[PDB]
Design a protein around this ligand. Structure first.
Ligand SMILES: [Zn+2]
Ligand SMILES: [Zn+2]
Ligand SMILES: [Zn+2]
Ligand SMILES: [Zn+2]
Lengths: 70, 88
DNA sequence: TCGGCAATTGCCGA
DNA sequence: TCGGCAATTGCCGA
């Protein structure tokens, strides 16, 4: 209940709040993202979670190109 | 702001939305920690600070080597693909 | 540090 | 799909 997603908020319907993409959206396989009330832009249910994810992949790629913790 | 630090909410005073710390926290000298909406967990705002920095480096680097914008897993617009446990 | 009302937002239910 | 009200909130003033 702390923060309901793009889809549910607009659908105006209860959001089961699960990480990282609430069952309702999971079930249907529609990406599940949160929504920035200020900007109106789509935005991930979880910033750190997105960051931690982002760098990982950044890192792996960097590794295949030879590098590291730069 | 729907972000107002664990401190501020408590005290019930107006959280000063900057990174790696909101104004009072700083002055009052303390660690500025945000209660992550979704996950519900604590998140020191700085931890995000640095973590943001780390993309930064990463983006110079990977760009240098001849790269830019990466495929992920958690995600941003109602137009990326979705998450699945374990697997990508 | 709080009472506490304004905004905000979850979500019934039809 | 949504009206509209419950429940949360940010945070003022004391
Ligand atoms: Zn949802
Ligand atoms: Zn969802
Ligand atoms: Zn604060
Ligand atoms: Zn703070």
């Amino acid at each position: 209940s702390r923060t309901a997603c793009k889809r549910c908020r607009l659908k105006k319907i209860k959001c089961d709040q699960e990480f990282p993409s609430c069952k309702r959206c999971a079930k249907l396989e529609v990406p599940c993202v949160s929504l920035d009330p200020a900007t109106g832009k789509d935005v991930p249910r979880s910033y750190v979670f997105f960051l931690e994810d982002r760098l990982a992949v950044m890192m792996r790629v960097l590794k295949e190109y030879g590098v590291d913790p730069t | 702001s729907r972000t107002a630090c664990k401190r501020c909410r408590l005290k019930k005073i107006k959280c000063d939305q900057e990174f790696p710390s909101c104004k009072r926290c700083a002055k009052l000298e303390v660690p500025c920690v945000s209660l992550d909406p979704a996950t519900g967990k604590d998140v020191p705002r700085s931890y995000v600070f640095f973590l943001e920095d780390r993309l930064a480096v990463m983006m110079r680097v990977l760009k240098e080597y001849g790269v830019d914008p990466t495929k992920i897993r958690g995600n941003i617009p109602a137009t990326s693909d979705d998450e699945p446990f374990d697997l990508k």
